[PDB]
Design a protein around this ligand. Structure first.
Ligand SMILES: CCCCCCCCCCCCCCCCCC(=O)O[C@H](COC(=O)CCCCCC)COP(=O)(O)OCCN
Ligand SMILES: CC(C)CCC[C@@H](C)[C@H]1CC[C@H]2[C@@H]3CC=C4C[C@@H](OC(=O)CCC(=O)O)CC[C@]4(C)[C@H]3CC[C@]12C
Ligand SMILES: Cc1cccc(COc2ccccc2C(=O)N(CCCN)Cc2cccs2)c1
Ligand SMILES: CCCCCCCCCCC
Ligand SMILES: CCCCCCCCCCC
Ligand code: NA
Ligand code: NA
Lengths: 833, 84, 100, 20
């Protein structure tokens, strides 16, 4: 729709006050009305990165606004960036106008264009990044007389830097006449420009062709205003590597900023020029006190310059002193994206955990109003700052802990389906913090194990309120828990103070004979009995041994005993069931109404509440309910044995088979549910066909459920579709049987069961450490892993060997060596003349 | 905790007989009081292998004991090797 | 590894007085100078100290007198009187076990 | 999803992006 045009033969105020904003940058593309322009894949990329740079910095792009070649391509990339701001101001047998430039200002036109861009270079700006002065860059890529005087009237009149590149007619000439000092090279303009564009010279006079030598040689009077985008730069970020190096040349060669090292820094920080700021600013010949490196640091954090945050820290900057109380609150509401904070609302409400509630409250108390480094780390983790958060992680104190808390915080924010691009990136970043915490902890465990396991259970000083183990189970970090350091820790927490090298049977035979513990039979690590009978392998072995002897005594009570009076056997049957209930109520904490959602732990409570009702029917003294108190004991005897069968089932397949099992358990429960649905519908069909048509009660609703199980434990033409029922009901129920068989397969497999073997054993170790009959009777290590982190960061940094075998340093280290041989060849010719 | 200091304007016996052991090696790091020192990933590695070498051979590392740049980095690698 | 007047006379009073060997490396101000003035025999290179040390650290020379700047040429050239006491940890040694 | 979007008892009752 839009596009403004002004016929023209003082100007700048009629477009910054009436129309639009201010310029942090200003690019000049000069080709002129070249009706042909060979757009390669390279030149299509150079002038597409350039408009993205002008989109980022907010520049004006002055060019000739006619619909030909580059200037129609520059215009159509501008509307591509307004589809996915850029102000492409245009100034111009006959050319047609370009319908893609934002403002039009239409040979005869290249004087008002110069005297405008020479005025914007003249300005003084109180924002003052480039010493004020509004950075002007002039590109050049093609040939002709017009683009030659455009480089002239830029460089000669004022100081805008000019960038050329080696693909074109005369921009390849000046790309060849800059790697040469020949005392201005008075006729090498003729020795160039003819052998690389031979048809333009035989179209005009000699006195103007020599004027082109006068044109070119006054460009080269200042080679600090001439950057060349060379051809071998086959990579991204080479336009901004040339624009910033052109702006750094024109700024630093003002002969006024010798005391102004900071203005060179903020320029080289806005562009991502790390390898230029390291060797031209931080070289210890320049005098800085590392005290004014703080406002430059706060800009390196908010604009996401991760390589500059790392450079400021390794040149001396105490990040603990820098992160004051108000810098964190100029960072959590000023520089916090609201799309993440809106996504932080949905994660806190829909998938709520204990870590998120600390994170949601610590985001809030900074946007409403002490571990400062671990607040900057969460700030750069929530916003998916991929490489800034890797710099702050290396400065934290609890580094294995914060690598797991970040890996949990991202894994919860990637459970939100509000945007699967942000939820796909943060899941990917969480999978490389869990990997970051594996290989840091295997570095900690390759040192002494007593310190690395001191670190697993560190009290966190309220990081999230949990140690590294608790923060890894809730994140379901299967790679952190399947590592051999954590598995060795759990197998020592389960074997207890008994050594794991004694034997397996040697522990069991000490239960049946107590005086074998006091000898040198077991090789544990004065009253070793309180150490033997507190290890949860012995507590589990005694509880199963007690539970079998409880079932062999409940079998004697049921058959031989139980005449009419609850004699001395049946009273202690309450007391053994009472400690099977007293431990359940003391484990009835931490349930959340989801502990009973597994059909083997609600079965435990429903086996006692179906047994307590057997003590109710016991103490009624009538034969009509004494026998009803026996059939509810005999039915409950099978429930107590299936729990023993389930204990033997889990404790034998506690390994690689614990994933196949307990997935097949809920797959057979679904088949038995579908079989119960079919037996109900078979009961209605069998009751509706047979007799007693209308002679009914609530007899029916209690028989139809059970009549097919009593059936388990007129043929006119309907008998043939009765078989088609038994060819359909057999098919849909056998498929549910085979889905139960093979459903464990479909759906890295070592870390799946090692997480489950960890999660089950730590669930049992979180019970009481005393056996069944006796339930009624009841910053020095953070400094160590800071050493272990620096040893680890050396490992991953010197793994750049297959990138060191990429010889891009060796492809160019002999270019300096062949030019060392080149220049000595030339000067020895000058002596013998 | 520890760390002994002596104000000073014949010396060697007051540290090998009263204090500690003999030297199979002896390294001298000279920078002086450069308050700034650009520690690269490379210079962080050269002066971390060096203290491991002095840990292995049992050396003395004479340097300027002030808390700036390299000499505060040389000091903090030394406490990293007494931790590990 | 670094520059300044103090680390230049420290290499001097080591090599000149007794024989401790001295190790430098090519990352720094004047330790890069002597890392560049050892792969060269120019009969003690009487003014290549001026042809070095200026194009690789240009701000320290315009802070002091000339007669002491020429004394730095006298400082550097008596280090190179024995090049068997001068090992250079070069930059392309991208591997472990290069300090030892 | 290619069926009717109304429940069972109520069945009886019934170039700008190419540039992107
Ligand atoms: C009515 C009351 C019925 C009473 C039942 C009588 C019980 C008889 C004893 C049989 C023990 C059950 C075996 C369970 C099992 O196999 O778990 C086995 C234990 O195997 C052994 O201890 C070796 C010899 C056992 C022989 C015991 C006499 C699991 O072995 P483990 O714990 O080492 O490995 C776990 C991960 N695979
Ligand atoms: C007639 C009765 C009283 C004599 C038979 C005694 C067994 C019924 C008891 C004593 C030894 C017990 C076992 C001791 C060792 C095993 C293996 C153990 O599994 C592991 O060691 C896994 C390792 C880990 O979890 O880290 C779990 C308990 C279990 C099955 C116990 C289940 C029941 C057992 C076989
Ligand atoms: C009928 C009934 C009701 C309550 C308690 C019991 C006694 O149950 C045990 C006996 C011996 C050892 C351990 C247990 C026992 O508590 N487990 C079974 C352990 C193996 N899955 C419960 C669980 C622990 C971890 C997850 S589930 C029996
Ligand atoms: C791990 C093998 C354990 C064998 C069982 C030990 C003997 C139990 C019966 C002792 C009376
Ligand atoms: C009409 C009955 C046809 C025979 C059914 C055989 C099913 C066998 C299932 C074994 C898994
Ligand atoms: Na059937
Ligand atoms: Na079947």
């Amino acid at each position: 729709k839009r596009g403004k045009y002004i016929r023209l033969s003082t100007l700048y105020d009629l477009m910054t006050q009436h129309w639009h904003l201010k310029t942090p940058n200003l690019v000049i593309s000069v080709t002129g009305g070249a009706k042909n322009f060979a757009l390669k894949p390279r030149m299509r990329k150079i002038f597409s990165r350039l408009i993205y740079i002008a989109q980022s910095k907010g520049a004006w792009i002055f060019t000739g606004g006619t619909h030909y070649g580059l200037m129609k391509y520059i215009g159509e990339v501008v509307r591509d960036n307004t589809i996915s701001n850029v102000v492409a101001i245009g100034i111009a047998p006959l050319y047609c106008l370009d319908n893609n430039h934002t403002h039009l200002l239409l040979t005869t036109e290249a004087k008002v264009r110069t005297q405008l861009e020479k005025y914007i270079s003249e300005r003084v700006i109180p924002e003052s990044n480039y010493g004020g002065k509004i950075p002007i860059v002039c590109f050049a890529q093609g040939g002709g007389k017009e683009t030659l005087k455009s480089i002239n009237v830029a460089i000669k009149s004022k100081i805008p830097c000019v960038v050329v590149e080696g693909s074109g007619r005369i921009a390849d000439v000046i790309a060849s006449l800059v790697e040469a000092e020949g005392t201005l090279a008075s006729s090498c303009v003729k020795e160039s420009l003819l052998r690389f564009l031979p048809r333009t010279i035989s179209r005009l006079s000699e006195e103007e062709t020599e004027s082109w030598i006068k044109w070119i040689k006054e460009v080269l009077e200042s080679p600090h205003l001439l950057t060349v985008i060379k051809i071998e730069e086959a990579g991204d970020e080479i336009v901004s590597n040339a624009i910033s190096f052109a702006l750094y040349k024109a700024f630093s060669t003002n002969e006024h900023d010798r005391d102004n090292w900071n203005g060179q820094l903020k320029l080289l920080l806005e562009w991502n020029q790390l390898d230029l700021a390291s060797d031209e600013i931080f070289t210890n010949d320049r005098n800085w006190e590392s005290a004014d490196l703080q406002d430059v640091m706060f800009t390196a954090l908010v604009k996401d310059r991760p390589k500059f945050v790392r450079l400021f820290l390794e040149n001396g900057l105490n990040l603990r002193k820098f992160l004051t109380t108000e810098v964190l609150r100029e960072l959590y509401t000023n520089n916090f994206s609201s799309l993440v904070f809106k996504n932080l609302q949905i994660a806190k409400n829909s998938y709520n955990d204990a870590l998120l509630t600390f994170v949601w409250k610590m985001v809030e108390d900074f946007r409403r109003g002490r571990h400062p480094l671990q607040a900057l780390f969460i700030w750069s983790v929530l916003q998916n700052k991929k490489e800034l958060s890797k710099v702050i992680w290396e400065q934290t104190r609890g580094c294995t802990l914060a690598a797991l808390g970040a890996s949990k915080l991202l894994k919860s924010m990637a459970k939100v389906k509000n945007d699967i691009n942000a939820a796909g990136e943060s899941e990917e970043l969480a999978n490389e913090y869990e990997t970051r915490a594996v290989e840091l902890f295997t570095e900690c465990y390759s040192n002494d194990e007593d310190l690395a396991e001191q670190l697993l259970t560190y009290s966190c000083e309220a990081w999230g309120g949990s140690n590294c183990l608790e923060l890894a189970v809730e994140a379901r970090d299967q790679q952190f828990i399947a590592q051999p350091g954590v598995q060795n820790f759990l197998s020592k927490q389960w074997y207890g103070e008994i050594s794991r090298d004694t034997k397996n049977w040697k522990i069991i035979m000490c239960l049946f004979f107590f005086p074998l513990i006091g000898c040198g039979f077991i090789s544990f690590r004065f009253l070793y009995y309180v150490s033997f009978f507190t290890s949860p392998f012995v507590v589990f072995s005694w509880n199963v041994i007690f539970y079998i002897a409880f079932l062999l005594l409940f079998a004697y009570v049921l058959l031989m005993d139980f005449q009419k009076e609850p004699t001395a056997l049946e009273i202690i049957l309450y007391v053994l069931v009472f400690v099977l209930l007293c431990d359940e109520v003391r484990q009835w904490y931490m349930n959340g109404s989801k502990y009973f959602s597994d059909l083997w732990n609600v079965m435990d409570t429903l086996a006692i509440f179906y047994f307590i009702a057997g003590i109710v029917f016991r103490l009624h003294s009538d034969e009509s309910s004494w026998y009803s108190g026996r059939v509810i004991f005999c039915l409950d005897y099978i429930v107590f044995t299936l729990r023993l069968i389930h204990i033997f089932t889990v404790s034998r397949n506690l390994g690689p088979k614990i994933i196949m099992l307990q997935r097949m358990m809920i797959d057979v429960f679904f088949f038995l549910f579908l079989f119960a649905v079919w037996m109900v519908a078979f009961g209605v069909a069998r009751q509706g066909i047979l007799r007693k048509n209308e002679h009914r009660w609530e007899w029916i609703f209690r028989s139809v459920i059970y009549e097919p199980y009593l059936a388990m434990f007129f043929p006119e033409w309907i008998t043939i579709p009765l078989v088609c029922i038994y060819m359909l009901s057999t098919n849909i129920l056998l498929v549910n049987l085979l889905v139960a068989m093979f459903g464990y397969t479909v759906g890295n497999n070592d870390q799946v069961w090692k997480f489950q073997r960890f999660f089950l054993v730590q669930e049992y170790c979180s019970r009481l450490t005393i056996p069944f009959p006796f339930v009624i009777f009841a910053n020095e290590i953070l400094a160590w892993e800071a050493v272990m982190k620096e040893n680890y960061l050396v490992k991953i940094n010197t793994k750049a060997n297959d990138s060191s075998e990429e010889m891009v340093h060796r492809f160019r280290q002999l270019d300096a060596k062949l030019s060392d041989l080149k220049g000595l060849l030339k000067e020895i010719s000058s002596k013998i003349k």
